[PDB]
PDB file of C-alpha atoms in Angstrom:
ATOM      1  CA  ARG K   1      37.185  17.755  20.331  1.00 15.07           C
ATOM      2  CA  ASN K   2      34.463  20.317  19.609  1.00 13.97           C
ATOM      3  CA  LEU K   3      34.123  18.901  16.091  1.00 17.46           C
ATOM      4  CA  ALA K   4      33.827  15.363  17.445  1.00 17.62           C
ATOM      5  CA  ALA K   5      31.139  16.438  19.911  1.00 16.01           C
ATOM      6  CA  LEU K   6      29.267  18.450  17.276  1.00 17.09           C
ATOM      7  CA  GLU K   7      29.317  15.546  14.817  1.00 18.24           C
ATOM      8  CA  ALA K   8      27.952  13.235  17.506  1.00 19.33           C
ATOM      9  CA  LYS K   9      25.209  15.739  18.352  1.00 16.75           C
ATOM     10  CA  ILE K  10      24.257  16.210  14.699  1.00 16.89           C
ATOM     11  CA  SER K  11      24.137  12.493  13.915  1.00 15.97           C
ATOM     12  CA  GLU K  12      22.131  11.611  17.017  1.00 16.00           C
ATOM     13  CA  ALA K  13      19.685  14.494  16.579  1.00 20.78           C
ATOM     14  CA  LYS K  14      19.092  13.713  12.906  1.00 20.84           C
ATOM     15  CA  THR K  15      18.607   9.969  13.337  1.00 24.18           C
ATOM     16  CA  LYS K  16      16.471  10.287  16.479  1.00 22.92           C
ATOM     17  CA  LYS K  17      14.220  12.934  14.930  1.00 20.88           C
ATOM     18  CA  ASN K  18      13.824  10.891  11.746  1.00 19.06           C
ATOM     19  CA  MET K  19      12.898   7.702  13.603  1.00 16.19           C
ATOM     20  CA  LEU K  20      10.557   9.601  15.931  1.00 13.17           C
ATOM     21  CA  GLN K  21       8.775  11.174  12.962  1.00 11.81           C
ATOM     22  CA  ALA K  22       8.485   7.808  11.209  1.00 12.92           C
ATOM     23  CA  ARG K  23       7.074   6.110  14.307  1.00 15.80           C
ATOM     24  CA  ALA K  24       4.627   8.957  14.939  1.00 18.23           C
ATOM     25  CA  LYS K  25       3.433   8.691  11.338  1.00 19.04           C
ATOM     26  CA  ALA K  26       3.010   4.928  11.707  1.00 17.70           C
ATOM     27  CA  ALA K  27       1.087   5.391  14.961  1.00 17.68           C
ATOM     28  CA  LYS K  28      -1.261   7.976  13.457  1.00 17.80           C
ATOM     29  CA  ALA K  29      -1.816   5.709  10.452  1.00 16.23           C
ATOM     30  CA  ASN K  30      -2.704   2.838  12.790  1.00 15.00           C
ATOM     31  CA  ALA K  31      -5.087   5.082  14.736  1.00 13.85           C
ATOM     32  CA  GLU K  32      -6.726   6.149  11.470  1.00 15.43           C
ATOM     33  CA  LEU K  33      -7.104   2.486  10.508  1.00 16.57           C
ATOM     34  CA  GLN K  34      -8.766   1.733  13.847  1.00 16.90           C
ATOM     35  CA  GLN K  35     -11.090   4.723  13.431  1.00 17.56           C
ATOM     36  CA  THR K  36     -12.071   3.561   9.944  1.00 19.86           C
ATOM     37  CA  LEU K  37     -12.735   0.074  11.309  1.00 20.42           C
ATOM     38  CA  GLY K  38     -14.987   1.690  13.908  1.00 19.04           C
ATOM     39  CA  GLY K  39     -16.237   4.271  11.408  1.00 22.74           C
ATOM     40  CA  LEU K  40     -17.878   1.856   8.964  1.00 23.38           C
ATOM     41  CA  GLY K  41     -21.052   3.373   7.525  1.00 27.57           C
ATOM     42  CA  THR K  42     -22.597   0.411   5.686  1.00 27.25           C
ATOM     43  CA  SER K  43     -25.282   0.333   8.404  1.00 25.69           C
ATOM     44  CA  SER K  44     -27.074   3.167   6.564  1.00 25.91           C
ATOM     45  CA  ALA K  45     -28.903   0.509   4.517  1.00 25.22           C
ATOM     46  CA  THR K  46     -31.194   0.166   7.539  1.00 26.26           C
ATOM     47  CA  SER K  47     -33.041   3.147   6.053  1.00 28.35           C
ATOM     48  CA  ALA K  48     -33.821   1.210   2.867  1.00 27.90           C
TER      49      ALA K  48
ATOM     50  CA  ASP A   1     -35.018   3.492  -0.748  1.00 27.19           C
ATOM     51  CA  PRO A   2     -33.394   0.950   1.592  1.00 27.74           C
ATOM     52  CA  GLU A   3     -32.224  -1.099  -1.404  1.00 31.34           C
ATOM     53  CA  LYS A   4     -30.020   1.707  -2.721  1.00 31.04           C
ATOM     54  CA  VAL A   5     -28.808   2.762   0.756  1.00 33.34           C
ATOM     55  CA  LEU A   6     -27.619  -0.752   1.796  1.00 34.86           C
ATOM     56  CA  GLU A   7     -26.260  -1.380  -1.794  1.00 33.50           C
ATOM     57  CA  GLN A   8     -24.068   1.792  -1.474  1.00 33.09           C
ATOM     58  CA  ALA A   9     -22.974   0.607   1.972  1.00 31.65           C
ATOM     59  CA  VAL A  10     -21.824  -2.698   0.470  1.00 30.28           C
ATOM     60  CA  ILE A  11     -19.923  -0.832  -2.249  1.00 28.96           C
ATOM     61  CA  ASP A  12     -18.226   1.385   0.342  1.00 30.51           C
ATOM     62  CA  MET A  13     -17.265  -1.734   2.292  1.00 34.87           C
ATOM     63  CA  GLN A  14     -15.688  -3.086  -0.899  1.00 36.04           C
ATOM     64  CA  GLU A  15     -13.360  -0.072  -0.811  1.00 35.64           C
ATOM     65  CA  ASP A  16     -12.810  -0.219   2.953  1.00 35.29           C
ATOM     66  CA  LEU A  17     -11.547  -3.805   2.855  1.00 33.56           C
ATOM     67  CA  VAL A  18      -8.990  -2.818   0.205  1.00 32.07           C
ATOM     68  CA  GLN A  19      -7.910   0.163   2.307  1.00 32.96           C
ATOM     69  CA  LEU A  20      -7.402  -2.082   5.334  1.00 31.36           C
ATOM     70  CA  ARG A  21      -5.441  -4.536   3.180  1.00 32.25           C
ATOM     71  CA  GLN A  22      -3.187  -1.653   2.135  1.00 34.19           C
ATOM     72  CA  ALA A  23      -2.728  -0.661   5.780  1.00 32.85           C
ATOM     73  CA  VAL A  24      -1.792  -4.249   6.646  1.00 32.92           C
ATOM     74  CA  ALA A  25       0.745  -4.277   3.816  1.00 29.79           C
ATOM     75  CA  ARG A  26       2.249  -1.031   5.112  1.00 30.17           C
ATOM     76  CA  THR A  27       2.531  -2.497   8.611  1.00 34.40           C
ATOM     77  CA  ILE A  28       4.204  -5.620   7.207  1.00 34.57           C
ATOM     78  CA  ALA A  29       6.729  -3.460   5.362  1.00 34.48           C
ATOM     79  CA  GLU A  30       7.451  -1.394   8.479  1.00 36.92           C
ATOM     80  CA  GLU A  31       8.040  -4.464  10.637  1.00 39.11           C
ATOM     81  CA  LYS A  32      10.310  -5.978   7.984  1.00 39.00           C
ATOM     82  CA  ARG A  33      12.339  -2.763   7.810  1.00 42.16           C
ATOM     83  CA  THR A  34      12.775  -2.503  11.578  1.00 42.14           C
ATOM     84  CA  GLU A  35      13.714  -6.193  11.753  1.00 45.08           C
ATOM     85  CA  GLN A  36      16.408  -5.667   9.125  1.00 43.64           C
ATOM     86  CA  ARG A  37      17.692  -2.561  10.906  1.00 44.23           C
ATOM     87  CA  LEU A  38      17.986  -4.227  14.312  1.00 46.02           C
ATOM     88  CA  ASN A  39      19.496  -7.360  12.697  1.00 47.22           C
ATOM     89  CA  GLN A  40      22.257  -5.357  10.959  1.00 49.23           C
ATOM     90  CA  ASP A  41      22.865  -3.220  14.056  1.00 47.75           C
ATOM     91  CA  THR A  42      23.492  -6.364  16.098  1.00 48.86           C
ATOM     92  CA  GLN A  43      26.186  -7.322  13.584  1.00 50.61           C
ATOM     93  CA  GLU A  44      27.726  -3.845  13.648  1.00 48.36           C
ATOM     94  CA  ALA A  45      28.032  -4.239  17.413  1.00 50.49           C
ATOM     95  CA  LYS A  46      29.916  -7.512  16.924  1.00 48.73           C
ATOM     96  CA  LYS A  47      32.202  -5.838  14.382  1.00 50.08           C
ATOM     97  CA  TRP A  48      33.024  -3.100  16.882  1.00 47.60           C
TER      98      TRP A  48
END
């Protein structure tokens, strides 16, 4: 029974951590994309 | 001069559009993967 419980714990922890990390990476990538969209610097030609 | 400044801004935009296209492709891939995962999980539930 301890082995069954430990296997369940290991599987759930591994899969949940992996998916959480993947989703956090996707979210930060999306935030970076939004920043770049707002961070466009082509307006510097106003100096010329 | 303003000519060079705005010209460089246009060039940088040429890169930025490609970067955003890459981000869109990544998002498409992620959504496809999650769709496949949920779709196969629903079938595993029916098997159980």
